Structure 1
Amino acid sequence: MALLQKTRIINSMLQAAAGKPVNFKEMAETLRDVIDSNIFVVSRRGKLLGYSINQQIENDRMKKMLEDRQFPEEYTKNLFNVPETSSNLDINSEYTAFPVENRDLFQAGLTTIVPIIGGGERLGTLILSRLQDQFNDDDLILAEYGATVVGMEIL
């Protein structure tokens, strides 16, 4: 579908979502649907405010993080070192969203890190991940729109 179709899907969601209580799961699912990627909305200290999986997780340590709604400390602290969007980070990146013990299986795994910013303040991080298919400009447009509005719906 055109980008205009995908932005219309996000917009339709945002237009209905006010003034119901904020739903970060719904925002994560909508972004998963239009970007075709796993989506994690991560607080400054690693809390999963919302997420949506595009591919089943066959890693017990990762499935635990979802259940706990919490990402690891060191991983989470290091996200602050990325000040702007950084896309298509591969399995060997310290920022990868794939479990390092399964690097071989996820050799084609790609990760995009999108700072969520909220008032001169870093409020969290929007993480996107998927296999094989490089993120493009349209994906970034949609990811950054999501991160921006998430930053608004966070406040």
Structure 2
Amino acid sequence: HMALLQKTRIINSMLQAAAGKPVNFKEMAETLRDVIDSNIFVVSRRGKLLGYSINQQIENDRMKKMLEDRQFPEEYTKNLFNVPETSSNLDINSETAFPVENRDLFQAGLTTIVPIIGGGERLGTLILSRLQDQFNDDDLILAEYGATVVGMEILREKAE
């Protein structure tokens, strides 16, 4: 599992290294983009865009609007909060607990939703998207490791 081991080391060094620099969500998004090989969006518990990075353009009006608003609409924020654990490979044909009216979030590509949890609290949501390649268990290991680090840093920014 050597590639996975190397990739966990890159994420893990985020937890263990330095601890000096201020929090930078765009930088974290970029790191996870390259390690996981996926679009990365970091959303707060209240639906605010904290940071993102894209390596594969996907046509999605709902995500585009979120980017423009730097915020999900209230209903979408609520339905993300209602995802209690990692939900992967969501698409147009998905089988999930988003109301049909809000499944335009999965218009195109494949989406994985990973709750960000820190200090026993829901701190936000890590959303990953790819044009065509499925997320496998290795991808989920890295996504969940990344989510935990982002949670760590959301707390730091709270206390900054």
The alignment's TM-score, normalised by the length of structure 2, stands at: 0.79
Aligned partners of 1:146 and 1:123: how far apart in 2? 13
Aligned partners of 1:62 and 1:133: how far apart in 2? 19
Aligned partners of 2:57 and 2:9: how far apart in 1? 27
- The Cα of 1:63 is off from its aligned counterpart by 3.5
Distance change >3 Å, CA 120–CA 8, structure 1 → 2: closer
Aligned partners of 1:101 and 1:56: how far apart in 2? 23
Q: Secondary structure at the match of 1:83?
A: coil
Aligned partners of 1:14 and 1:91: how far apart in 2? 35
- The Cα of 1:105 is off from its aligned counterpart by 13
Unmatched segments (≥5 aa) in structure 1: none
Higher mean alpha-carbon deviation, 53-62 vs 127-136, is at 53-62
- The Cα of 1:11 is off from its aligned counterpart by 3.4
Higher mean alpha-carbon deviation, 26-35 vs 72-81, is at 72-81
Aligned partners of 2:34 and 2:136: how far apart in 1? 16
Q: Is the 8 A contact 1:42 1:124 kept in 2?
A: yes
Residue identity over aligned pairs, in percent, reads 100
The count of aligned residue pairs is 154
Distance change >3 Å, CA 48–CA 5, structure 1 → 2: same
2:124 aligned with 1:120, yes or no?
Answer: no
1:24-73 Cα shifts (integer Å, max 9, x gaps): 11111111101111111101111111111122365666444324322222
1:90-134 Cα shifts (integer Å, max 9, x gaps): 12459x999999999987611111001112211110000112211
Q: Is the 8 A contact 2:63 2:105 kept in 1?
A: no
RMSD: 3.6
Q: Is the 8 A contact 1:41 1:48 kept in 2?
A: yes
Q: Secondary structure at the match of 1:105?
A: helix
Unmatched segments (≥5 aa) in structure 2: 156-160
Q: Secondary structure at the match of 1:97?
A: coil
Distance change >3 Å, CA 30–CA 18, structure 1 → 2: same
Aligned pairs for 1:105-116 (under 5 A) are 109-116=109-116
Distance change >3 Å, CA 36–CA 19, structure 1 → 2: same
Q: Secondary structure at the match of 2:17?
A: helix
Tell which has more relative contact order, 1 or 2 (C-alpha 8 A, sep 6+): 2
Aligned partners of 1:124 and 1:84: how far apart in 2? 12
Aligned partners of 1:61 and 1:87: how far apart in 2? 18
